[PDB]
Amino acid sequence: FKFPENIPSDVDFRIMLTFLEFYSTLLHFVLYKLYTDSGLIYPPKLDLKKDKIISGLSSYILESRKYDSPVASLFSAFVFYVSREVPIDILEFLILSCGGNVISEAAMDQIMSKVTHQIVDRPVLKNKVAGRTYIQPQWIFDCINKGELVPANKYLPGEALPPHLSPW
Amino acid sequence: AIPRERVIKAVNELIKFTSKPKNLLEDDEEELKKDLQLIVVNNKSFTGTSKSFKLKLLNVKHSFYKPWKEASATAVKDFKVLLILKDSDIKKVSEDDLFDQLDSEGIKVDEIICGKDLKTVYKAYEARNAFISQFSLILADDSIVTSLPKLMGGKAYNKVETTPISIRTHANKEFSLTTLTNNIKKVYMNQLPVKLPRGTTLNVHLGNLEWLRPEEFVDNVELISEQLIKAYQIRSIFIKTNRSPVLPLYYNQDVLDELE
Amino acid sequence: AAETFKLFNKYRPETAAEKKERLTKEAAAVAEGKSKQDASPKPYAVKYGLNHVVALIENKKAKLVLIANDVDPIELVVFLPALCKKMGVPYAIVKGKARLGTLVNQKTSAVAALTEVRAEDEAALAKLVSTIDANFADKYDEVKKHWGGGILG
Amino acid sequence: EYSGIIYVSRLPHGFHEKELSKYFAQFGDLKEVRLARNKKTGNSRHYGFLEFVNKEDAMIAQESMNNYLLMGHLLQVRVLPKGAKIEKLYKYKKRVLVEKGITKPVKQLKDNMKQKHEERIKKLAKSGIEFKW
Amino acid sequence: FVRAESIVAKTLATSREKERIKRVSILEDKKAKNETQHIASGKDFILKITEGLIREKTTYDGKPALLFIVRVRGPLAVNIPNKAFKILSLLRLVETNTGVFVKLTKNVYPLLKVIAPYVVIGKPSLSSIRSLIQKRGRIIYKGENEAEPHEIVLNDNNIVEEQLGDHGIICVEDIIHEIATMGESFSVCNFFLQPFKLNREVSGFGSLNRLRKIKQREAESRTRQFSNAATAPVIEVDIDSLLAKLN
Amino acid sequence: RSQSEREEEWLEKLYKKHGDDYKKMFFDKKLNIYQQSEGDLKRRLLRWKKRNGI
RNA sequence: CCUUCUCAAACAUUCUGUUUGGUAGUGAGUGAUACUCUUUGGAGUUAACUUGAAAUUGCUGGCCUUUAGGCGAACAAUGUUCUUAAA
DSSP: OOOOOOOOSSSOHHHHHHHHHHHHHHHHHHHHHHHHHTTSOSSOEEOHHHHHHOOSGGGEEOOOOOOOTTTTTTTTTOBEEEOSSSOHHHHHHHHHHHTOBOOBHHHHTTOOOSOOEEEOOOSSOSSOOSSSEEEOTHHHHHHHHHTSOOOSTTTSTTOOOOOOOOOO | OOOHHHHHHHHHHHHHHHTOOOOOSSOOHHHHHTTEEEEEEEETTOOOSSOBOOOOOEEOSSOTHHHHHHHHHHSSSOOOEEEEEOHHHHHHOOHHHHHHHHHHHTOOOOEEEEHHHHHHTTOSHHHHHHHHHTOSEEEEEHHHHTTTHHHHOHHHHHSTTTSOEEEOSBSSSSBOHHHHHHHHHHHHHSEEOOOBOSSSEEEEEEEETTTSOHHHHHHHHHHHHHHHHHHSOEEEEEEEESSSOOOEEEEOTTHHHHHO | OHHHHHHHTTTOOOOHHHHHHHHHHHHHHHHHOOOOOOOOOOOOOOBOOHHHHHHHTTTTOOSEEEEESOOSSGGGTTHHHHHHHHTTOOEEEESOHHHHHHTTTSSOOSEEEEOOOOTTTHHHHHHHHHHHIIIIITTSHHHHTSOOOOOOO | OEEEEEEEEOOOTTOOHHHHHHHHTTTSOEEEEEEEEOSSSOOEEEEEEEEESOHHHHHHHHHTTTTEEOSSSEEEEEEEESSOOOOOOOOOOOOOOOOOOOSSOHHHHHHHHHHHHHHHHHHHHHHTOOOOO | OOOSSHHHHHHHHHHHHHHHHHHHHHHHHHHHHTOOSSOSOSSOEEEEEEOOOEEEEEEOOSSOEEEEEEEOOOOTTOOOOHHHHHHHHHTTOOSSSOEEEEEEOSSSHHHHHHHTTTEEBOOOOHHHHHHHHHHOOOEEEOOSSOOSOEEEOSOOHHHHHHHSTTTTOOSTHHHHHHHHHOSSOSHHHHHHSOOOOOOOSSOOSSHHHHHHHHHHHHHHHHHOOOOOSSSOOEEEEOHHHHHHHHO | OOOOHHHHHHHHHHHHHTTTOSHHHHTOOTTOTTOOOTTHHHHHHHHHHHHSOO
């Protein structure tokens, strides 16, 4: 997670930099074959103001020059409303693995018609829209580990959760 | 206003005064001093309670810089024209660009100097004073004008020719050569410099008697004096040669009542 | 010596790379043609060839001369203090010909003459000359006449 | 013989007695330090005087500074002889202006104006070339 | 055995810097008391250095905003006065490489003319601000059992809501969000995320990095301009490319 | 033996700057930076005129 | 061993005009004609010249603040305390 880490004085970078540069060049050419094999341009363009919103995979636009069921295009046509409270990054990437949309108010204050679902982890929810579904994020962590839909009564705040043990 | 007749009386008196006569080959500077007109203005509180190195350019009917130049060709010191411009300004402006505009009305810029050149080439008091003393007419961009006095030296701010003159190449966002072109014409032939010292004493330099017509002297003096009266509350006016004693022409006795 | 080096690093000569680079610039200009103008004031630099340094004396042209103390054929050098003495040239004996070669893009130089100076630097030149003539010509002139060394080790 | 009192000429701009103290203390402790300043504006006249606790320390300091190039122009230091004492220096500030009221009322000095104008007319008679006004 | 040159050059540098802060204080007292008849420019200006380097000038905004100031190493050999030291000490900018978040208003603005030769100013991006806060940041903290001069990096959101449950500030993502917002509380984040540290950008000594130092000193001499006019435009640089270096 | 294009263009600049007179073009700084000899100027201009422009 | 305020507004369109504001000095020496007060204490102004930033003691303005700062800014004010220009 994107947290400031206390640096260890015990380690020496002089090895991990060599591993870094080796893996960097290796993964670089592997990204070349995966981008050309997927048929699109190997340098990925990004809008600069989209990067100014968020420095993520969603900054890059991916050009041109089905999905395997069910996990790809799971939650198809599905509009999320991730909060400012949630960790935006890995949930953003999971929704992108779903193909659904991401709407975070944290992105909004840089500067809501189709939103049906709030991923949020808060005790007290303010506007409490009955149309909008209130869900603690483990639902996304459990639905993709099953590949399938589960009921969200456990994921409704502030209901307790099943102790998740992943498929390993 | 001011009785023009009295001014003609005084200037004819001064012509008669300067008409009064092992010698030098090359003539005395003092002999050149005793031929020249200076206007002296007594006025209440001519301070701004602060030093004013800025020169006021008074609109004058006649232009003494051309008889200056015509006698300066005969004279030892040669009349020269200095402009001080920005670095980008000198990068854009060329010399034939100036000379073509100035031969239209028949004048000439001697030199153009960047503030860089002032701060490295003449960053030495001897060379700087020698370089300044060559010049009579010194112009500078109004932006540079308020940056000058560390670079110019106070010896330049002592005299009237040596202190620079505010002039503007800009009228819009950027400068135009048209603005500098007619602006050097305005400052050259339609305006005369004014030092603004402290105290109640103002000294205004007019020039040698041999340069202009005496009634033209009178016209320029009365125009300037009306400009001063409309400008400032004035105690008195004494015009004279710096060798000669004063000449009382005009004074307002109620200004001193109005001071306090 | 520190201010003398600050002076002469203002007047470094052009390197072969910088020379060839400017040559390629002006040659590509003429190759387009695009003959921009015909104007350049002069190159000013230090002068460093030994026969060239002696050559700049006996005109005289040398405004300052630096002389390295250590040369293995010393006899190449020994006339130069007396020669600048009689020619009145403001010589100064510098310490180390490698430091001369650094300011002139050589390994060593052993001599350093300087003639032409811009107007920005000319006033610094004269006070440096007066500084050296105070510090060198006044201090060491009589002890120059004395037989040095002779004390055993 | 020479004293510990010291004359220093050719000082650079903005280089003052505080800096003189802070520098020459490293030679050894100094007795007194003064700069010749101008009266209307407290600017350096580029020469000053030092005094040390010792004459020998004064000579040591004078040796390493006599032909010392510094911030443009070089400096020159000379110790004084044994018959020499410090006299009459002061840190002058910039003396600002003062404005004091005219003592005489306005009609007394109107009369003074009227008298001085006629008097200057009498001088134009006395010099004298004609001037009817 | 200190030097004879630096003692005089610093004295001239003190004369220059103290006099320009004097002229700043004069002209700002004239603007503030509105006894204005004799000044150069009535309103202030904001200069924008971006990429032979363009500088865009926009008139001042009467609106509060977010800035991320960057304490630069100051100019060459200057002893800095007490008026600038007071402003820097109220802004915690001693021990350089500390860029800190600040508020643009009209009353905080006259400080920006004074600190400008020692800091750099600009508009940062919320992705860059995000990466600053999620990678760097210390919290002076009162904990379990300490002598308690201790600072923790941003890990516990419950530590955050512990001291900031009154303002209702939880989950440091929201601290990023409401440093961006400044609608409810921004100076509370100045109390809480009070310390800041940046890295030194060049490895420094040694041949391969001395060339980098020389090139970046040329870059800094281009980007920083020193005005000393007391009508000094505020100079903004893109912090977004700048935090590709310093974070 | 003809002339080179740059230097005949240089002569062409001199021919329009001064005309035909040689004492003015001899003391010209711009476009006579090699300070050519008084009559070498004449020789090159006469060769240029016989080549081009009468 | 540093580098110096390198523009502001208003009106107007004339292919750029018009008005206003924005500038503390290098020290020393020579010196013309004067001006103004101050209450004799002189003070503040006025031509012109010299000089490698030259160099030898011109005895203690006033007012106000704090324990040095402003008079070119009055609830005005100021310090010499920036480290990868190290070692």
